[PDB]
Amino acid sequence: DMYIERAGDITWEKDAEVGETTDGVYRVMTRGLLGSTQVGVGVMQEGVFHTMWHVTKGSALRSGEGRLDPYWGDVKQDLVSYCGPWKLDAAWDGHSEVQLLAVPPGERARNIQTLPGIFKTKDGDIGAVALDYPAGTSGSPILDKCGRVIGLYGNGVVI
């Protein structure tokens, strides 16, 4: 039994550290007998819930009273969307600072501004934020200066 609950708006913050379909950033929760815990984070935008495939593994999600079914995915890229196509088309410019809107398990959302590093791995040269958050923070949106989601926290971006 797996569900989402809202955690905040998706905003670029000045003064940062350097079923219901409301736009915003959501905790992805799994419950059982003992109780509930966060498996990841996602982004509601234009009526579509975006998270990482490995967070849900294509499970349906309860959203209050309603139920969200997966619409699309890509296991290689580790992406999955609910209710509609992938709406997050923005991308890192390759030079600017970005903001991780990290939403850790059992803690408040927060913006961290940082410059992405480039990691020259074997598979490819990969851009990633040098910020380390607990497991279940995966799917936290990363924002450009215009407030657009340029990626989700967990994997990084191939160039």
Residue 142 interaction partner, one of ligand A1I16, its own copies, none, beta carbon < 5-8 Å per kind: ligand A1I16
C-alpha–C-alpha distance, residues 83 and 123, integer Å: 32
Q: Least separation, in Å, of the C-beta of 131 and its own copies?
A: 8
Judged by CB under 6 A, does residue 157 bind ligand A1I16? yes
Question: Is 129 in contact with 113 (CB distance < 8 Å)?
Answer: no
Judged by CB under 6 A, does residue 156 bind ligand A1I16? yes
Q: Least separation, in Å, of the C-beta of 74 and its own copies?
A: 25
Task: Single out the residue of 83, 81, 66, 87 nearest to residue 20, CA to CA.
Answer: 66
Token code pair at residue 90: 């923005």
Token code pair at residue 153: 């926290």
Residue 118 interaction partner, one of its own copies, ligand A1I16, none, beta carbon < 5-8 Å per kind: its own copies
Judged by CB under 6 A, does residue 42 bind ligand A1I16? no
Q: What character string, x for contact with its own copies (CB under 8 A) and - otherwise, covers 97-126?
A: ------------------xxxxxxx-----
Match 């509930």 to its residue by tokens.
Answer: 36
Question: Is 82 in contact with 68 (CB distance < 8 Å)?
Answer: yes
C-alpha–C-alpha distance, residues 6 and 22, integer Å: 8
Judged by CB under 6 A, does residue 123 bind ligand A1I16? no
Residue 95 interaction partner, one of its own copies, ligand A1I16, none, beta carbon < 5-8 Å per kind: its own copies
Q: Is 1 a catalytic residue?
A: no
